[PDB]
Design a protein around this ligand. Structure first.
Ligand SMILES: CCCCCCCC/C=C\CCCCCCCC(=O)OC[C@H](COP(=O)(O)OCCN)OC(=O)CCCCCCC/C=C\CCCCCCCC
Ligand code: HEC
Ligand code: HEM
Ligand code: HEM
Lengths: 241, 62, 64, 71, 49, 378, 106, 51, 54
């Protein structure tokens, strides 16, 4: 019977009504995943064909396919050989099977990172408040050999070890690589992965509020000028005296 | 008696059904190009920058 | 780092000091005897909730 | 059950008028606004009292659930 | 006459469904190790031995 | 001669909606039947592409859904139509059923009884559909209900093995649930041409009670341009909801992938079964609970035989007006309670609220209508 | 059943008369009843001057409702000027039906 | 109610309880064959229709 | 299964794998060799007994 803390609400640049996702926090967010998060988590639904026009040019991310070459399957007489990789291929998965994860990670299977945004109360502000939170154990609580304290997590004790602090990464641009801004540019990358639709549909909801506008007081006019005969009729009853 | 805008409007192209039907076809044709241009422009200006076009000049003509 | 500077700025308002005063009173009583029952997770919870509520309005301004 | 076989009716008269000879909004904001008034008035003395009750029970129930865990 | 033509339709899509044979009559003998409760995708809901 | 009158085929549509007598004072609460007609028709054209690209296999059950959302051209639009156009369908149906009772419309013996059969049939179709996506709520509704029909006195054991088509949920599950959830719509577009054929012999009612043959009006053009305005206003509301805030209605527990093992923390259904779930959970024991859940659909049938009044409808009746609003306020207290744990204080309100659903219908509206009769001498 | 309280029964009956609202449309109490097979008989036993009136009080008060209005205040049907025109023709269609039904019983 | 009270409706009831009883008997026994109801298919061992 | 490299093995498993599927496959393949038998008789007769004046 333990209480849970709820993340507050922040002013994102894409928060409501009509405003979009700035493609620089996302351009600078794959790299924070690429050189930190990935060697454990999977992105199987997400493939390199997707990023051709959101964060990088077509050959700019093509060159990221050669960085690691995936193992292949059955070909002629010498199958199980290695291929350089091309545009179609998916985000390479770390283990042979997911059952290897309990072997090295204390019997704690890492959650997949394709829907982690939508599968949580909170959302893209629960994850952010998770990262900077890590705190001190209070007076009078025991822990396992391999557990950590966090007042946001429902069990208050999570296996994962704080993966962000000062000077972790080198941004390709030169913006100060600090914990505060690395956390924000991860909470922006994952959201766009949860939805690739978040920007196409905010534009079909504005060109539609205008077709209705033009056509929804013109049917009202026809309707009103058929019911006037019917709305202006008087009536009698003089009976025989 | 004074010429109302609809007075000569009803005579020329509103009589039978025929010219009442031509203009309905032609009316939309001179309407979709004007309506398309003035609808996307407000989308860009409201939040320009953030989009992918307004940064890709960093990669152009070398 | 910019968060490190603002957290104590946002702890300055008295909305967060009072619950902070509450935390110590049980904290010393609990440690005074190993026979106590309270674990200060509850009194911890009031302090973080109030602090992190006021941090929200400002931190995004004092970024880059 | 068509129009010529429905009922029998005596000495009464009606006085219609054309649609192209008149206007569709005679008085739009001088009649409709006092109209909505007498309507709602006459009727919001037996539609509101039932929905006050669900509000009183709602606030009494979340209050109890909250203070049974957080002392 | 009208008996068989419906008794067969009753069992065509059911009566172990023809995919249920394998592990109710299976010869595994606890592929699960000692002291653990591993889940198998048989019996519809996971089988535990 | 007149072509419509004498042609053997046009002769049928001319008597049905071009030229039939209709009452003068019909309101806008009579627009919902045609909305349902519109509402039923989307769901079959949508639901066509959701099986055409749909794959029926156990292994891909979770993954087929998340797949179709992004990969398929124009798939993200059409998927949220099937899930949001089915929460519309259930708000034009509690408005339609409520309206008839107020104005005394159940004195059509033929049509108020063909309608209570249509109410069970669409409950079933919805409850399979939640169970197709498979993810960690589809599975954890399915166990709850499926298990409980095993408390039938002599047959319950034999039924859970047939629908499973195996020991339990299995690959065959896609085969059957799709099979019965596919079938259901097409029996409903048959009991609707019969629900309307018994009404073309008396005509409509009107919000006064009294019978009005001295001023009828054709059905064109007077209610075929009021019916269009209505339907357009509806496409407007259905589209604010899928292009601005689609996810406002569902629950963020569905996505978590297909695992037999994992434990859903807070089981609870979609919002329009949350008054059923509060009944079943209110009573001790297996066998008495299932009986209190079929009772409500089965209670509408005792309707015409409890009527004690000289007048038809509640328009001219103040005392019986007030109760109406109570039954409704008290069906909002069974939707709030049912989406939470049993609770320390939620059991006492929680099962006081339920009986009253029963007390008013079976005891208090028949008595109160008599004091009205006696008070104006019939 | 009471006598000294019959002033109070009058008091409650004048309040319930006004709360129900058929007088603001001009109707009379007998205009509102529900027409089943027994009220459909007792209508074609009426003289012509009584039957013609009933068809104009029911057509003027079903046109005021198509327009969402009510008649001026000087034309509201008072309390002590409502005459029960269809009552006597209806006690007689009924008591002739209890007679055809206790013959089949004996 | 009173429209249906009498000796003649009770006499028709006792006259057609043969009809109701045969109707119900045939319906109940048919409901055994229709749904492959083994639970009463065994009450008589004479129908060995289960292969 | 409308899978271009899953389609052919589908019928091959149905005409082996499931109860009585070998009956149903063949009734569907043969019950239209005869629906096309019916057509040529129902048509040719109407060119004997003057049946087109309808
Ligand atoms: C949220 C839940 C829904 C809330 C809807 C609230 C609507 C409020 C506006 C309606 C009230 C109003 O305007 O004034 C009363 C107004 C008076 O109108 P008249 O008939 O002309 O009477 C004239 C003299 N009395 O009343 C009405 O119009 C009633 C209209 C019919 C009510 C239909 C609403 C349906 C909601 C109830 C559904 C509950 C039963 C469902 C049954 C399902 C069983 C499984
Ligand atoms: C191999 C060590 C490892 C590192 C380094 C790592 N992850 Fe994690 N990640 C894990 C494990 C293990 C879990 C939780 C598994 C469990 O609790 O059962 C996890 C959980 C998560 C979660 C969800 C947290 C929660 O409370 O559910 C996210 C999001 C995530 N990882 C992404 C990331 C991100 C972003 C980073 C960089 C900040 C990162 N991973 C670095 C292994 C790692
Ligand atoms: C009254 C009519 C109907 C209702 C209320 C209804 C309701 C639902 C609901 C609530 C879901 C849940 C899926 C989700 O949450 O995304 C669903 C899924 C589904 N429905 Fe229906 N449905 C109706 C008609 C139909 C019809 C006619 C078909 C015809 C094939 C159909 C086929 C499907 C399919 C294939 C799914 C797949 C699950 C998924 O893709 O998410 N439905 N339905
Ligand atoms: C798919 C479901 C349904 C459809 C398509 C449907 C459709 C309709 C339509 C089109 C009408 C025309 C009259 C009007 O528009 O007012 C009508 C009337 C009516 N319906 Fe339904 N209906 C459905 C479900 C129900 C249900 C569940 C009931 C439950 C009692 C019901 C009872 C009635 C009644 C009593 C009327 C009489 C109209 C009157 O009072 O004048 N219907 N229905």
């Amino acid at each position: 019977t333990d209480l849970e803390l709820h993340a507050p609400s922040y002013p994102w640049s894409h928060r409501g009504l009509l405003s979009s996702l700035d493609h620089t926090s996302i351009r600078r967010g794959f790299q924070v995943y690429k050189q930190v998060c990935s060697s454990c988590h999977s992105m199987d639904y997400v493939a390199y064909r997707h990023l051709v026009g959101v964060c990088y040019t077509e050959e700019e991310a093509k060159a990221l396919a050669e960085e690691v070459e995936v193992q292949d399957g059955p070909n002629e007489d010498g199958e199980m050989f290695m291929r350089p990789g091309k545009l179609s291929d998916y985000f390479p998965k770390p283990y042979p099977n997911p059952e290897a994860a309990r072997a090295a990670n204390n019997g704690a299977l890492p959650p997949d990172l394709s829907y982690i945004v939508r599968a949580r109360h909170g959302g893209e502000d629960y994850v952010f408040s998770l990262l900077t939170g890590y705190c001190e154990p209070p007076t009078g609580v025991s822990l396992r050999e391999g557990l950590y304290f966090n007042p946001y997590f429902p069990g208050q004790a999570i296996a994962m070890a704080p993966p962000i602090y000062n000077e972790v990464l080198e941004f390709d641009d030169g913006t100060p690589a600090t914990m505060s801004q690395v956390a924000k540019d991860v909470c922006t990358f994952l959201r766009w992965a949860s939805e690739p639709e978040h920007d196409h549909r905010k534009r079909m909801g504005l060109k539609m509020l205008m077709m209705m506008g033009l056509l929804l007081p013109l049917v009202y006019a026809m309707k009103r000028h058929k019911w006037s005969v019917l709305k202006s009729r008087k009536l009698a009853y003089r009976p025989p005296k | 008696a004074a010429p109302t805008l609809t007075a000569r409007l009803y005579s020329l192209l509103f009589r039978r059904t025929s010219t009442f039907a031509l203009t309905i076809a032609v009316g939309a044709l001179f309407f979709e190009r004007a309506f398309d241009q003035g609808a996307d422009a407000i989308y860009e200006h409201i939040n320009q920058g953030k989009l992918w076009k307004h940064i890709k000049h960093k990669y152009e003509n070398k | 780092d910019p968060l490190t500077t603002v957290r104590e700025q946002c702890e300055q308002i008295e909305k967060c000091i009072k619950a902070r005063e509450r935390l110590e009173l049980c904290d010393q009583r609990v440690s005074s005897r190993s026979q106590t029952e309270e674990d200060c997770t509850e009194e911890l919870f009031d302090f973080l909730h109030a602090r992190d509520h006021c941090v929200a309005h400002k931190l995004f301004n004092s970024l880059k | 059950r068509e129009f010529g076989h429905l009922t029998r009716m005596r000495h009464v008269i009606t006085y219609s008028l054309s649609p192209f000879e008149q206007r569709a909004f005679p008085h739009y904001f001088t009649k409709g606004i006092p109209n909505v008034l007498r309507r709602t008035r006459a009727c919001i003395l037996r539609v509101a009292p039932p929905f006050v009750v669900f509000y009183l029970v709602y606030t009494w129930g979340t209050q109890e659930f909250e203070k049974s865990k957080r002392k | 006459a009208a008996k068989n033509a419906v008794s067969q339709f009753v069992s065509s899509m059911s009566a172990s469904a023809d995919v249920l044979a394998m592990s109710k009559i299976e010869i595994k003998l606890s592929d699960i190790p000692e002291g653990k409760n591993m889940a198998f995708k048989w019996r519809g809901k996971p089988l535990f031995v | 001669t007149n072509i419509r009158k004498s042609h053997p085929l046009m002769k049928i549509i001319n008597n049905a909606f071009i030229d039939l007598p209709a009452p003068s004072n019909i309101s806008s609460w009579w627009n919902f039947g045609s909305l349902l007609g519109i509402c039923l028709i989307l769901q079959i054209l949508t639901g066509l592409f959701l099986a055409m690209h749909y794959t029926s296999d156990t292994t891909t059950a979770f993954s087929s859904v998340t797949h179709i959302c992004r990969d398929v051209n124009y798939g993200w639009v059409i998927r949220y139509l099937h899930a949001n156009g089915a929460s519309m369908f259930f708000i034009c149906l509690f408005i339609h059923v409520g309206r008839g009772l107020y104005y005394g419309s159940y004195m059509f013996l033929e049509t108020w009884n063909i309608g209570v059969v249509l109410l069970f049939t669409v409950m079933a179709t919805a409850f399979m559909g939640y169970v197709l996506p498979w993810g960690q709520m589809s599975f954890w509704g399915a166990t709850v209900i499926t298990n409980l029909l095993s408390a039938i006195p002599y047959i319950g054991t034999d039924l859970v093995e047939w629908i499973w088509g195996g020991f339990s949920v299995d690959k065959a599950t896609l085969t059957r649930f799709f099979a019965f959830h596919f079938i259901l719509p097409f029996i409903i577009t048959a009991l609707a041409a019969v629900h309307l054929l018994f009404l073309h012999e008396t005509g409509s009612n009107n919000p006064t009670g009294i019978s009005s043959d001295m001023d009828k009006i054709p059905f064109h053009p007077y209610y075929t341009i009021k019916d269009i305005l209505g339907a357009l206003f509806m496409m407007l509301i259905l589209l604010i909801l899928v292009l601005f805030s689609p996810d406002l209605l569902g629950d963020p527990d569905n996505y978590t992938p297909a695992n037999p093992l994992n434990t859903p923390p807070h089981i609870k259904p979609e919002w329009y079964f949350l008054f059923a779930y509060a009944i079943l959970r209110s009573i001790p024991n297996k066998l008495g609970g299932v009986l209190a859940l079929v009772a409500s659909i089965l209670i509408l049938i005792l309707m015409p035989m409890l009527h004690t009044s000289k007048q038809r409808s509640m328009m001219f009746r103040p005392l019986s007006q007030c109760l109406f609003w109570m039954l409704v306020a008290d069906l909002i207290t069974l939707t709030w309670i049912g989406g939470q744990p049993v609770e320390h204080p939620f059991i006492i309100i929680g099962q006081l609220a339920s009986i009253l659903y029963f007390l008013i219908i079976l005891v208090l509206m028949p008595i109160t209508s008599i004091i009205e009769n006696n008070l104006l001498k019939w | 059943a009471v006598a000294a309280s019959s002033k109070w029964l009058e008091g409650i009956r004048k309040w319930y008369y006004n709360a129900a609202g058929f007088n603001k449309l001009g109707l009379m109490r007998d205009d509102t009843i529900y027409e089943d097979d027994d009220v459909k008989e007792a209508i074609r036993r009426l003289p012509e001057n009584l039957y013609n009136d009933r068809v104009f009080r029911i057509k003027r008060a079903l046109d005021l409702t198509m327009r969402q209005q009510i008649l001026p205040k000087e034309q509201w049907t008072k309390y002590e000027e409502d005459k029960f025109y269809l009552e006597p023709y209806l006690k007689e269609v009924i008591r002739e039906r209890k007679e055809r039904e206790e013959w089949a019983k004996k | 109610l009173s429209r249906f009270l009498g000796p003649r409706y009770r006499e028709l009831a006792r006259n057609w309880i043969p009809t109701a009883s045969m109707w119900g008997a045939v319906g109940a026994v048919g409901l055994v064959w229709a749904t492959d109801w083994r639970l009463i298919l065994d009450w008589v061992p004479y129908i060995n229709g289960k292969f």
